[PDB]
């Protein structure tokens, strides 16, 4: 019926097949590389940059603005601060660029550029996702990476402008269901959301293999 209900609904299984990805399976339970956690954090940054630029040309559109929290969720800032810890000052220049974290990018511009309207699914997919498993996978990395003192590396995991992610996840849920569309709309939201979690598979495929082979 709402629309962050039938969300839920319909990614549910492409959601678990993400969870499943070898490269997430072995996150999850605390097998995780510093080569490994450097490649998820240069993605991220790529993949928010890219939805946050289309965000910011899409803030004012009744198909967006009612999801519109900056403060509340930006992350380019936090990834920014991060990647200067894991690859030092010149980072913005040797971060790597994958064909897997392009592909991710290229949707969210397409999206952004000419079907605005689905900008929501990729939102939701980010935010909500990252916002919630963010303590979970904050204190796993922190056990196996073995950091240095030095107070930094994983501000990512933190959004420090949200006191309560539950509370926060309802109104945003409530905003999400006010959003008004044409049915032929709605449909396209929902399998957007499919590609979304598509996209993140197809990610962690291909960091597994670039870590393996
Ligand atoms: C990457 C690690 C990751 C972890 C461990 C994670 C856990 C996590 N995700 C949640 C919600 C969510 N999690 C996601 C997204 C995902 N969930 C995923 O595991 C993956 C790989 C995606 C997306 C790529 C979304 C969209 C929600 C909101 C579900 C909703 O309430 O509608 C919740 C709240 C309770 C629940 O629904 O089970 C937890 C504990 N989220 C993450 O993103």
Known sequence: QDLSEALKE????????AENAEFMRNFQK????????????????????ALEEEIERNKESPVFAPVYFPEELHRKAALEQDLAFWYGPRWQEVIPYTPAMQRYVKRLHEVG????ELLVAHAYTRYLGDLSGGQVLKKIAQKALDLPSSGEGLAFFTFPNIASATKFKQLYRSRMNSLEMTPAVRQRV????????????????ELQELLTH
């Open 113 to 116: 550029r000419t079907e605005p």
């Open 190 to 205: 929902i399998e957007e959301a499919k590609t979304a979690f598509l996209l993140n598979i197809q990610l962690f495929e």
């Open 30 to 49: 605390g097998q995780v590389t510093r080569d490994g956690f450097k490649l998820v954090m240069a993605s991220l940054y790529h993949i928010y940059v």
């Open 10 to 17: 319909a990614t549910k299984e492409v959601r678990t097949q």
